[PDB]
Amino acid sequence: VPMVFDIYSRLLKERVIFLTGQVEDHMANLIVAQMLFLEAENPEKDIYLYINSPGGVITAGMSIYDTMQFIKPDVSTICMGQAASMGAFLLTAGAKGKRFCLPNSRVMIHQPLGGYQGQATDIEIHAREILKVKGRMNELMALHTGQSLEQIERDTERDRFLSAPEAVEYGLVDSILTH
Amino acid sequence: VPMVIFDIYSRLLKERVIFLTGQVEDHMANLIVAQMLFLEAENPEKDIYLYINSPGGVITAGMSIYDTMQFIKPDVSTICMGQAASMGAFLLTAGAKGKRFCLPNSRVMIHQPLGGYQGQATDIEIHAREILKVKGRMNELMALHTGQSLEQIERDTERDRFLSAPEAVEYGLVDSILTHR
Amino acid sequence: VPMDIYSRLLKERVIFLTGQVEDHMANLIVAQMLFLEAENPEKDIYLYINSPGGVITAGMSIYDTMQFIKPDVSTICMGQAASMGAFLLTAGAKGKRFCLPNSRVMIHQPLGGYQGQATDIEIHAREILKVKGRMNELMALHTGQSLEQIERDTERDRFLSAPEAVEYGLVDSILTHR
Amino acid sequence: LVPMVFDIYSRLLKERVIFLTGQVEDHMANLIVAQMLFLEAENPEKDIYLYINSPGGVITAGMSIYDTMQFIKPDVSTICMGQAASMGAFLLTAGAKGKRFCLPNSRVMIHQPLGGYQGQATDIEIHAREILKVKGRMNELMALHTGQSLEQIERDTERDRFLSAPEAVEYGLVDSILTHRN
Amino acid sequence: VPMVFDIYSRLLKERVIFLTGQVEDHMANLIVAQMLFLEAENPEKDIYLYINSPGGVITAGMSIYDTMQFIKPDVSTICMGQAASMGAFLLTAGAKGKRFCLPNSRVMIHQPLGGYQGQATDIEIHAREILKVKGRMNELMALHTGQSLEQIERDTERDRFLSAPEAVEYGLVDSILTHRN
Amino acid sequence: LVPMVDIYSRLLKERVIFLTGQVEDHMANLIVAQMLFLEAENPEKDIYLYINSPGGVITAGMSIYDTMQFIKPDVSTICMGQAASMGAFLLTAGAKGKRFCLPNSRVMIHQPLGGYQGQATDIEIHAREILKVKGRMNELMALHTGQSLEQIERDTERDRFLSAPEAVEYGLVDSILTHRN
Amino acid sequence: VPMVIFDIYSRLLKERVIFLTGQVEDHMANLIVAQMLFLEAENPEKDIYLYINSPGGVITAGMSIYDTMQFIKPDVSTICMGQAASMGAFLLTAGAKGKRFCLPNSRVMIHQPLGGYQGQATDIEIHAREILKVKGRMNELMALHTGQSLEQIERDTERDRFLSAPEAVEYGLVDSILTHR
Amino acid sequence: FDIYSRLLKERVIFLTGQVEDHMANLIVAQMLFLEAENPEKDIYLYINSPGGVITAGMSIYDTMQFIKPDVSTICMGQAASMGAFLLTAGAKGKRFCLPNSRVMIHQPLGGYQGQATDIEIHAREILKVKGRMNELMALHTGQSLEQIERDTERDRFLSAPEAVEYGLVDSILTHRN
Amino acid sequence: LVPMVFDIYSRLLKERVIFLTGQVEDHMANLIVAQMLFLEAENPEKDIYLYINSPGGVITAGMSIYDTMQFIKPDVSTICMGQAASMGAFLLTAGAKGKRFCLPNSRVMIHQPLGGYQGQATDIEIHAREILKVKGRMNELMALHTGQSLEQIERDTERDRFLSAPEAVEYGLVDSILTHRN
Amino acid sequence: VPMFDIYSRLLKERVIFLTGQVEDHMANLIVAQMLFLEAENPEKDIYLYINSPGGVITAGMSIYDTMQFIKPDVSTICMGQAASMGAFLLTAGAKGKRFCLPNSRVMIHQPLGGYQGQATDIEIHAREILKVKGRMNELMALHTGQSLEQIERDTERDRFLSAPEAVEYGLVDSILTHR
Amino acid sequence: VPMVFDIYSRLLKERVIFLTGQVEDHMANLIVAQMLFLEAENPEKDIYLYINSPGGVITAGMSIYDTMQFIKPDVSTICMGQAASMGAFLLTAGAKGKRFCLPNSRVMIHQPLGGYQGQATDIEIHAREILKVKGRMNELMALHTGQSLEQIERDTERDRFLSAPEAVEYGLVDSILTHR
Numbered sequence A: 001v002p003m004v005f006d007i008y009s010r011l012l013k014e015r016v017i018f019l020t021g022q023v024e025d026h027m028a029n030l031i032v033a034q035m036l037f038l039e040a041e042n043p044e045k046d047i048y049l050y051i052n053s054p055g056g057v058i059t060a061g062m063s064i065y066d067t068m069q070f071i072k073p074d075v076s077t078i079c080m081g082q083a084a085s086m087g088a089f090l091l092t093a094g095a096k097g098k099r100f101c102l103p104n105s106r107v108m109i110h111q112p113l114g115g116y117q118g119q120a121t122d123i124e125i126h127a128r129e130i131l132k133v134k135g136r137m138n139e140l141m142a143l144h145t146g147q148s149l150e151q152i153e154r155d156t157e158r159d160r161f162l163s164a165p166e167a168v169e170y171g172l173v174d175s176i177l178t179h
Numbered sequence B, G: 001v002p003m004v005i006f007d008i009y010s011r012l013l014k015e016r017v018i019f020l021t022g023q024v025e026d027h028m029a030n031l032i033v034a035q036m037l038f039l040e041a042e043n044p045e046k047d048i049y050l051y052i053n054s055p056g057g058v059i060t061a062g063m064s065i066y067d068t069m070q071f072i073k074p075d076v077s078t079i080c081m082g083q084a085a086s087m088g089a090f091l092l093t094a095g096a097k098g099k100r101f102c103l104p105n106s107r108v109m110i111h112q113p114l115g116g117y118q119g120q121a122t123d124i125e126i127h128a129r130e131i132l133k134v135k136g137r138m139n140e141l142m143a144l145h146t147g148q149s150l151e152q153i154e155r156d157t158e159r160d161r162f163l164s165a166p167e168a169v170e171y172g173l174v175d176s177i178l179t180h181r
Numbered sequence C: 001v002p003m004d005i006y007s008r009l010l011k012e013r014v015i016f017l018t019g020q021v022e023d024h025m026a027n028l029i030v031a032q033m034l035f036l037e038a039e040n041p042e043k044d045i046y047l048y049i050n051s052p053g054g055v056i057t058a059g060m061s062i063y064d065t066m067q068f069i070k071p072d073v074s075t076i077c078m079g080q081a082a083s084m085g086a087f088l089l090t091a092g093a094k095g096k097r098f099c100l101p102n103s104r105v106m107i108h109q110p111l112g113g114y115q116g117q118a119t120d121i122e123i124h125a126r127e128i129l130k131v132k133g134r135m136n137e138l139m140a141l142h143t144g145q146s147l148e149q150i151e152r153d154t155e156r157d158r159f160l161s162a163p164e165a166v167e168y169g170l171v172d173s174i175l176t177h178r
Numbered sequence D, I: 001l002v003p004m005v006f007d008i009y010s011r012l013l014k015e016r017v018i019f020l021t022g023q024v025e026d027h028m029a030n031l032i033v034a035q036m037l038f039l040e041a042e043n044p045e046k047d048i049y050l051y052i053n054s055p056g057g058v059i060t061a062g063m064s065i066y067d068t069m070q071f072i073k074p075d076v077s078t079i080c081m082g083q084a085a086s087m088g089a090f091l092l093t094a095g096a097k098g099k100r101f102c103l104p105n106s107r108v109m110i111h112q113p114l115g116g117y118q119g120q121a122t123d124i125e126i127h128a129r130e131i132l133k134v135k136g137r138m139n140e141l142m143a144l145h146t147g148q149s150l151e152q153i154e155r156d157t158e159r160d161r162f163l164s165a166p167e168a169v170e171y172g173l174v175d176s177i178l179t180h181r182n
Numbered sequence E: 001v002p003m004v005f006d007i008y009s010r011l012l013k014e015r016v017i018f019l020t021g022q023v024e025d026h027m028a029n030l031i032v033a034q035m036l037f038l039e040a041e042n043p044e045k046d047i048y049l050y051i052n053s054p055g056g057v058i059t060a061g062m063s064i065y066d067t068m069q070f071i072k073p074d075v076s077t078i079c080m081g082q083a084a085s086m087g088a089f090l091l092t093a094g095a096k097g098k099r100f101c102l103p104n105s106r107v108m109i110h111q112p113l114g115g116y117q118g119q120a121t122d123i124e125i126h127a128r129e130i131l132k133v134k135g136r137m138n139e140l141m142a143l144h145t146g147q148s149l150e151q152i153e154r155d156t157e158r159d160r161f162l163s164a165p166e167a168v169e170y171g172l173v174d175s176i177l178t179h180r181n
Numbered sequence F: 001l002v003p004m005v006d007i008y009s010r011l012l013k014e015r016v017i018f019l020t021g022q023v024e025d026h027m028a029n030l031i032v033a034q035m036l037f038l039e040a041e042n043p044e045k046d047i048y049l050y051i052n053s054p055g056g057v058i059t060a061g062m063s064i065y066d067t068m069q070f071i072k073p074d075v076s077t078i079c080m081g082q083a084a085s086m087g088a089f090l091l092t093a094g095a096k097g098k099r100f101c102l103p104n105s106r107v108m109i110h111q112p113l114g115g116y117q118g119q120a121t122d123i124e125i126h127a128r129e130i131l132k133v134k135g136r137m138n139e140l141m142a143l144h145t146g147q148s149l150e151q152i153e154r155d156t157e158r159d160r161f162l163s164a165p166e167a168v169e170y171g172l173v174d175s176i177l178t179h180r181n
Numbered sequence H: 001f002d003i004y005s006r007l008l009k010e011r012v013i014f015l016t017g018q019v020e021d022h023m024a025n026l027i028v029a030q031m032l033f034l035e036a037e038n039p040e041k042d043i044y045l046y047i048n049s050p051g052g053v054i055t056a057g058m059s060i061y062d063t064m065q066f067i068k069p070d071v072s073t074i075c076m077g078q079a080a081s082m083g084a085f086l087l088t089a090g091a092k093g094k095r096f097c098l099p100n101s102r103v104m105i106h107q108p109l110g111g112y113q114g115q116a117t118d119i120e121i122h123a124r125e126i127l128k129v130k131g132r133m134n135e136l137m138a139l140h141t142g143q144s145l146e147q148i149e150r151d152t153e154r155d156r157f158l159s160a161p162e163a164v165e166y167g168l169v170d171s172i173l174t175h176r177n
Numbered sequence J: 001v002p003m004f005d006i007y008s009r010l011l012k013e014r015v016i017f018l019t020g021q022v023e024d025h026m027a028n029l030i031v032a033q034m035l036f037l038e039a040e041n042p043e044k045d046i047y048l049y050i051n052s053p054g055g056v057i058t059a060g061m062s063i064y065d066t067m068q069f070i071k072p073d074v075s076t077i078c079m080g081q082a083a084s085m086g087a088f089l090l091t092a093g094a095k096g097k098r099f100c101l102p103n104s105r106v107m108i109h110q111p112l113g114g115y116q117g118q119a120t121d122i123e124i125h126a127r128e129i130l131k132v133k134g135r136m137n138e139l140m141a142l143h144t145g146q147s148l149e150q151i152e153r154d155t156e157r158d159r160f161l162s163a164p165e166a167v168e169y170g171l172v173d174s175i176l177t178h179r
Numbered sequence K: 001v002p003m004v005f006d007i008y009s010r011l012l013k014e015r016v017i018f019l020t021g022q023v024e025d026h027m028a029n030l031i032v033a034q035m036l037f038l039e040a041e042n043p044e045k046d047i048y049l050y051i052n053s054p055g056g057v058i059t060a061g062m063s064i065y066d067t068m069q070f071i072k073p074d075v076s077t078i079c080m081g082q083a084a085s086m087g088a089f090l091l092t093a094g095a096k097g098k099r100f101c102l103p104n105s106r107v108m109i110h111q112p113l114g115g116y117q118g119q120a121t122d123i124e125i126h127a128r129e130i131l132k133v134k135g136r137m138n139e140l141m142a143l144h145t146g147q148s149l150e151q152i153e154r155d156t157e158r159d160r161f162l163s164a165p166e167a168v169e170y171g172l173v174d175s176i177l178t179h180r
């Protein structure tokens, strides 16, 4: 926190938000607030969301996704370091043509995780829900990547790593940032 | 905690935006009550905006928010982002009619009250009676805000029941879905 | 264990109920009663009781065994007999229930607790009251008190001295000396 | 985090509003006393508003607030939101007669004092004797503010008892229910 | 503990086995060993199984059930204290005409419980298995009690207590042992 | 506590061994000792191995497997309750025609589990060994069940449950033990 | 507890000096990226100075700094004080050609990547293949910045190796040694 | 008597689990006992172990070589680090693996905290142990010291057939008689 | 509790006073390095004053300070108050010649390096060899700044060695003792 | 910490508080406050309130050497208690300006310590703590006016002194009752 | 554990005692009891003490030393695995000419260890005591090994390991057992 009002605040005045670490309700709500704030200051200028995350909660990540799609400004996504699970999902949800990976970035995709304890009836309720989510997520990933739903299904059954150039060909990102 | 040129949650509080985040409990809820009472004093005519992303929490804490929402003059518009479960779903539906919203991929889970007690059998009967009264009042308010019958709310809350953003408008929990600005 | 010593007294038909009452120690008490019956179904059994309470179900497995087996089960309270230990004390064969001069007895209503959904909460609270009702019935049966009196005296902890227990009806007499 | 405007609670304090939230204990209660003394000094005649959402707490801590409400000239209007149990229910009814309020779905719980001690039978008698006096004064003060008899307060507090907002009006703990701002 | 040698061993010479506490692989394996041992001593004389259990693992309980049904001697079941989850299953799995409750016994029945963590694919695998178990347990309940399959399901969805006389009327046991002879 | 008459020892004179709980080096070494002991007393009489296990270590389980195959007497395997991971493997390793399930037994098969921390060079070494182990386990499974190696690989990639009748049709077991003689 | 004047690290940021201290991880690395992006905006032409005193850390986090150094226009001069091990040593040599430095008693340590995973053998193969790709790419970039052959980087990093300040010059990790100003 | 003891009267010893001072002494005592009963008949040491302390394991090794009777070693399940060492120390021609037994070998492990002077002392000793340990391996397997040095620098697994080729074991047991 | 004026340590930093306190480690040492670079920027002529009260710490962390002390233009004066052990005692003697000081009842303690490692024998040899190289360079630097022979520093650091304030001026660790100001 | 700070507002009055056990970090700030006050005016007295149950020897001696080195006289006031190192610094105040409050308590005892290791190392550290013990007794005798042989006999075991007992023994000059 | 009856007792009927693991008051008292018992059964036949120990308390170890020297039977010592600190002391305390190492046994020697918390006065008392111990242990080591007191001092100041052959030349052991 290089005080002056730290440094992350200086770069917020330039419309740059940092998504770092595990994604969860509180850090995600903080990202939503920043995106809503930047929209209010200027709904026409793009927003820049850097992503370096190993994954996190689905609900928390989707609160960011819906905010990215809701606000008028385009949200450009930049992956530095790694973007796994929901971090990869939000990376691909950026505005078309403005999704980027750095040359030595790293991306991992897989299916949702979950768990429940209780009576068998409750187990059925919660099991059928996480599958509904899996279908919702594969559909959305297929939409943003251009792959078919069936392809997303086969590649997310188990963890799958993609390099920065592999991430462009598969369709999660548009190009690689250089210079 | 990013700051402008003075904190971000405070800056959005000037635009009349309140965030209900995380587990619901007496202190975070009392903070929501304070923001609602504050916004009312500065301008009773204008709407209030309550974002809800919560997996549930205490009933007593949530009802301090509910009664404050209905008591203050300004309408409180409720916006569900991420998820709104248990009391988070209840407060979502308590927003002003026509101003309840879900985001396209939001989620809302509903169930009956939870509780527990240890002690003498006489004391157990007292608390078992009260928790059943709580369950009754919540279903009544749930039926009132959704337009559903009391018997349907009873049927659907006995066990956990997840609901999608469009399913929440059908069931009556919310009025519409926010899709792009 | 001086050894075995509890077994040497088992051949004299002496069973010891000691400590908290729970499924495992109670099952051992039931096994000894079944064993002593097999040895001689006509002779009395002697159950010393020194317990601060315990589980009802575990205690009722002992109660049901005493009533089922042919031999009369004489009960002797030494030290103290509280909650479920007091229940089994008074369940002894009429006329063969005893307290020692400085024994103590405590009675109260059942304890319990549960977590879960309101529907499930309602089921278990309705069951513990059924249990509370039955014990009060059995308490009234063995002591001779009215069901209304057992209710009033068990709503809160009540202590009874050895002579107070003979007047209340929990026990028949006091063992002083041989 | 607490939003800014100074704190959020600090501006509603300028509006003569104090918030009693959570367990009541020496420190949070002492803070409530400090706010009350501050508002009295600013203007002794204007009312003070005390919102109450508490599941109970220490008796001694609660009585430092009670005596402060009774001591200062300004009337202390009490508002129950969420719940007001054990010590929270006591301070609710100690508000200025005519200015005690519940919200429509508030819940109030009353019960007798609780305690505990380890030590000498001699010391046990001393502490068991004090807690019974506290129970006595607590019941008397409750009877005073509610209009109920001392004999009635004793019976209803022997075991936990829940009261709805309208039930709290009829029993006398609170004067009316606030539903919509006039 | 009382080495008469060992009291539970002396009672085994009389064909009496004790199922006590939580049912699990190890305590259940001992019961199977006792049943197989008693069968070898005399395949004709009955075996007596006392049951005081608050529940346990199904798989462990089913190893006892299949052994009870497989061996030639009839296995009479006696409920003392309480018989919940698997304890109620093994109680009613005793020989038709030889299942007993004590006057103040208590029986509780409910559906299976479980839990799993992992990938959604794995969750679907395990969640489908526990539902298969639920189906077979309810089927076995209908067989041994005489109740319909539809009835066992409706009564086991949530915890259901049965008194000793109630367990006789329902078909869980046949009679109540009160005072020998 | 163990009912004496020991009970597992009195059944050891009947050539009955019990494999119970998680399989590991110490309990498995004891199973080898009982098999070697029974072989010495009579290399022509069959051995009876009851299996009720949720899985365990591979090496420990394979010490039992190689012992079962080495001794002269046939080792008949009986699954009661459940037979998961390595427990299911040893079930199918029983002597041809002498593998049994009880009517309500449950069999579970899956691929090997493992994990390692260290330098990348060491990671490759252990990742390669578990892949060799995985390959050998599928080969042995295919040999004893009659299924193809391709089929075993499909069926073990993720947890798969088989009922007693599903285990006979698959080749894990030869028949089901229902009643005696 | 940094000493104020701004703060000490900020007053030193106005001179284009960034500090990489302690273990490398997502958060401490992200702040370094923010500082580099900020300094680029203040002046894309003036060099940036990165002091490095680290015993290692996460690769992914370290590569976010590497990619940022290569992405921004200004040259990033790296200074090693104390020690620079694992990813700290990688970023040390990723500095601008001609502007990488060690202090007289600095120490550099290089070794291959470390890692670990638990799960199914199939998942094990996936993650083991990935850490080896990372090992390959890291070795490739190291050979690039040092001028050494890939075989040499592979052969010297299989095990921990320490380099003194002068040794780091003749190896290619650093360009020269800073002694007196 | 007991099952492990009942098999001891037939000269069968079980080395199971981690190797450590106390379990190893039981192995040493049984070998001395057996020797006293009959110094000619062979002794049978089954091995299923993931490793353990060197000194404790070497107390077994020196006892096997010291006692008159031949000590036959049989690996069931797995025989790693020192367990692999003792497997190979069995009497020549009477060392055995089961068809699906596994074997893992690696160099010694250790650690110490203290002054630099003391660190040098203990680091010099573990390298002396490593030398003697590799020497003994070359003697019993027939491999060259250079080969043992290359193959133990990092963990190395050997299957039952690989263990007969490498020289750790003499043959593979499949069926009795 | 961080006295204010402004802060107190910030007020003395403007006077070119740096405090080395407690255990030496990467972060507290990095903070000391930053202050030295800052003071150099303000005026590369004036001297810097480093008070030392430490029981030791990591060598790499201490050497980041040492190399900074020698690299920057201004002289770094060292003052030992309380104690200066292992890494504290070296930084003390590494101060600018003629400006190294002990207070009258200060204490200096020196010894050889401590360390440890777990792993394969091959890895043990690498780390055992390296720590012996560090010990060598430390004795080399210690001998250079004190004026003692390398063999003497070796014989005196093999085991713990305590030195009083007057013992430290003769041994060569410090130049003189400050008893009273001016 | 009411109000800008209260300890900072009394620092303008040249009042320093030594509270709690003495250790390297809390002692460093007292040194910093003394050095700061010296710079502000080397001629006005400094006021050191002492309420401490003891602490580390080295940490306490950094304060002692600072008290004696700076030009201004350091007046010491004992309130509550002054035990081990707290008692030593109390008596180290400028002669004639050491004070006790009427019901303050002073406790003195010999140094405490401990070590694990080789016998040779045991001799070194036991030899050193006895040197520390030797100095501390010398300085106490120097500041109190007592004989060295007396300080030794009286510090071998815990010795409590009342405020009036402290004036006869020499630790302090007078007692501040009222004013 | 293998009830032959029992295995360690079966070998106690061959006058064989096992000193295994850490040396401490209770395991040492058990060793003392066996030595006193064997003396009672036959004061003439040698006793055989196998030693595999990484060290332990000095006083506990010296209770064994004084018993070996007090009883009439000679105590032959066998080092298997390792014999460190007090284990090495008792190894060499065996009857001269009857001390043995196995081919790959390991002996480690060093000076005493200790520690104390308290007042400086008490610190000196316990420090003077451990040094008196240190001086007394070195004396006996010199007596049993044939080395000089100065050599024992120099060589125990720091950990020093000795192989089986190194132990015969230093005087710790008489010969190496290899076959029978």
Ligand SMILES: *C(=O)N1CC=C1/C=C/C(=O)NC(=O)/C=C/C(C)=C/C=C/[C@@H](O)CC
Pocket (backbone or CB within 6 Å): I023, I055, I056, I057, I058, I059, I085, I086, I087, I088, I112, I113, I114, J056
């Ligand atoms: C000198 O210190 N160095 C050269 C090699 C070293 C190693 C130092 C080392 O391990 N230092 C520590 O971690 C020391 C920690 C201590 C002594 C902490 C003391 C804390 C106080 O609270 C004790 C009263």
